[PDB]
């Protein structure tokens, strides 16, 4: 799969396009279809999944929801080269990756590929949920520095939104602190405003 940027799609989540889905989970789809009484025979289930009926997409979305998957860069060099996430179904042909983990994965969002792997037994799902998961691999295992470290556009935004030219609109404004967004959005002051007094709890 080729890689893209997940601006949404929070940390514990990766974007599986539906085309690769319904193939990896095909035995799961067959089993659940036999469970719901919509397929009395394996051949009927095969015919229906090969016809991509609406119930097939529904049953996929129901079964893949709480089930981890794992992602892997082609040259994996260090500890975090392999990770796991929660799949989220996407209308496309590229797996969407969380932007922070691009630091550990050494990714660059150009022409690139990842391998995907679905753990089968409940045990493998368990160590994927406990050890493979990105919610636990924050600190590095080599030195101790937290691996997730923003350096891109988010940093430029944070730098811009904490500054002051000399004094923006409404230099002498005093507020309580929730009103700051209210006054940036409508009118009255800019984020570049200096000498602004507010109460902080």
């Amino acid at each position: 799969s080729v890689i893209t940027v997940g601006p949404y799609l929070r940390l514990h989540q990766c974007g599986l396009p539906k085309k690769m889905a319904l193939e990896l989970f095909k035995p799961f789809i067959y089993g659940k279809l036999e469970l719901r009484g919509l397929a009395t025979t394996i051949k009927a289930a095969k015919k229906m999944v090969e016809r991509e009926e609406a119930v097939v997409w529904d049953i996929l979305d129901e079964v893949i929801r709480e089930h981890p998957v794992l992602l892997n860069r082609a040259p994996t060099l260090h500890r975090l080269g392999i990770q796991a996430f929660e799949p989220v179904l996407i209308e496309g042909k590229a797996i969407q990756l969380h932007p922070l983990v691009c630091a550990a994965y050494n990714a660059d969002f150009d022409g690139d590929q990842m391998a995907v792997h679905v753990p089968l037994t409940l045990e493998a799902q368990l160590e994927a949920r406990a050890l493979m998961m990105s919610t636990n691999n924050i600190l590095s295992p080599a030195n101790g520095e937290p691996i997730i470290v923003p350096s891109q556009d988010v940093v430029l935004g944070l730098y811009y939104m904490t500054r002051d030219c000399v004094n923006a609109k409404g230099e002498g404004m005093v507020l309580t602190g929730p009103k700051e967004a209210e006054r940036l959005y409508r009118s009255g002051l800019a984020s570049l405003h200096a000498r602004v007094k507010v109460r902080i709890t």
Binding site: H12, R65, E66, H67, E86, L122, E123, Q125, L126, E127, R129, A130, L131, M133, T135, N136
Partner: protein, 74 residues
């Protein structure tokens, strides 16, 4: 979806025996014959067992207690 695994980790501490106990728990749930002691919220047996363990009710000991209690009940 469960976001992080820390509470059951604190309860077990080993970070590996939790995997084994949760596995043996979810196995008996999936094969049947057990009732989820924690209310389910339309979630599969894996995260359900994890939340039940993190609640402070299932471990390597109580599950064995139920096991030999039912074995002697035969």
């Amino acid at each position: 979806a469960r976001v992080t695994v820390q509470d059951a980790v604190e309860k077990i501490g080993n970070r590996f025996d939790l995997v084994l106990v949760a596995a043996r728990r979810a196995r008996q749930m999936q094969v049947g014959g057990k009732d989820p002691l924690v209310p389910e919220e339309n979630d599969k047996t894996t995260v359900i067992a994890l939340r039940e363990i993190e609640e402070g009710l299932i471990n390597n000991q109580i599950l064995d207690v139920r096991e030999r209690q039912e074995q002697q009940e035969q």
